[PDB]
Design a protein around this ligand. Structure first.
Ligand SMILES: Clc1cccc(CN2CCNCC2)c1
Ligand SMILES: Clc1cccc(CN2CCNCC2)c1
Lengths: 201, 194
């Protein structure tokens, strides 16, 4: 029965991927509140029953969209830091700040992660997502700066958690601004002062 | 008067709810228990508060008012001689007041969940921004912070300060978490203060 089981699993996975892809596209453009699951099923080319089979409700589909978008946010940030030509751990942290403002400025990321997710997931769910995706990259950037003597030896997690709070509030300030270009410049300038006050190099 | 009697009933309910939810959390104490603590009938309680969440919203207001009054008292008594020293005193005052067990449970743990993201952010901003922006404005005026628009720095610092408090709130060793987090916050602000 293994070909039959694997075939049904692969078909389920393809349906799931089409639904997430469709939902990510339409909610990214219009917002969660403005696109219903029937339109998303049509976009994905699946029936309502195929959708019900994969997702209990609209919010369950949104939770899976956030996972895929967060995975792409962190991969894009890692690509931009890798391509930055950062010569030291301190330069990699500055590159990571620039990458966060760039990727969180993507209109789809702004809409799904910064505007919809805190409301649709609620506080606990949104903070659990932010945490699962932010902590590893932040702790490793700190660890490498300590190892190079560019940051004081200290417990990594308390510093990581405070910086994640500062960086996520910076992104939210820009996302909710009516003049986001000015907000992004002003916020970039605050984070430059905060990071450059911390880093020894 | 009827208004004075209504106000006494309201005060008994807010006081009782603050006490019981302060100890056990919003999720773990129902309105029947609170009405018993307050010595108020359920009918008289539902007349004042549509539902559990409505009573909680009024508890958060009274607790937030006390948090900010206590912050102002501690900074006033700190002996801070300069705007930079007032900011340093306010960081210490926030870790002291957010360490109060009732503030920890009601503001750091329950309010974001019960009020929801948007509701909580509105209350947190309405209570945090005045004091934060005043402290920053005085430091900029004294030359001790870089010339810059106040609101962006205020919002990023409130994010750091609230995240520090919430990290301590759920720590396995809160005393240790507080010490290590106080060091981070003092170093973060010292890197920007002249
Ligand atoms: Cl140290 C550092 C500097 C810049 C960016 C990051 C990662 N972000 C943290 C906030 N949530 C998004 C990811 C870490
Ligand atoms: Cl500048 C400064 C320094 C420390 C404390 C505060 C006040 N707030 C208390 C509530 N949450 C945010 C911060 C401002």
């Amino acid at each position: 029965m293994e070909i039959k089981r694997r075939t049904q699993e692969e078909r389920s996975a393809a349906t799931r991927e089409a639904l997430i892809t469709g939902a990510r596209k339409l909610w990214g453009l219009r917002g969660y509140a403005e696109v219903g699951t029937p339109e998303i099923a049509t976009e994905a080319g699946v029936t309502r029953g195929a959708m019900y089979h994969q997702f209990a409700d609209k919010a369950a589909l949104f939770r899976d969209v956030v996972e895929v978008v967060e995975q792409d946010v962190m991969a894009r940030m890692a690509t931009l830091v890798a391509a930055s030509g950062a010569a030291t751990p301190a330069d990699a942290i500055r590159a990571a700040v620039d990458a966060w403002l760039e990727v969180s400025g993507d209109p789809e990321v702004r809409q799904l992660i910064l505007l919809d997710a805190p409301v649709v997931l609620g506080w606990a769910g949104f903070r659990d997502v932010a945490q699962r995706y932010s902590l590893g990259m932040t702790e490793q950037l700190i660890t490498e700066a300590i190892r190079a003597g560019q940051l004081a030896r200290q417990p990594v997690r308390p510093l990581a958690q405070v910086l994640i709070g500062a960086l996520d509030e910076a992104a939210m300030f820009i996302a909710t601004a009516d003049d986001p270009k000015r907000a992004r410049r002003e916020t970039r300038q605050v984070l430059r002062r905060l990071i450059d006050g911390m880093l020894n190099g």
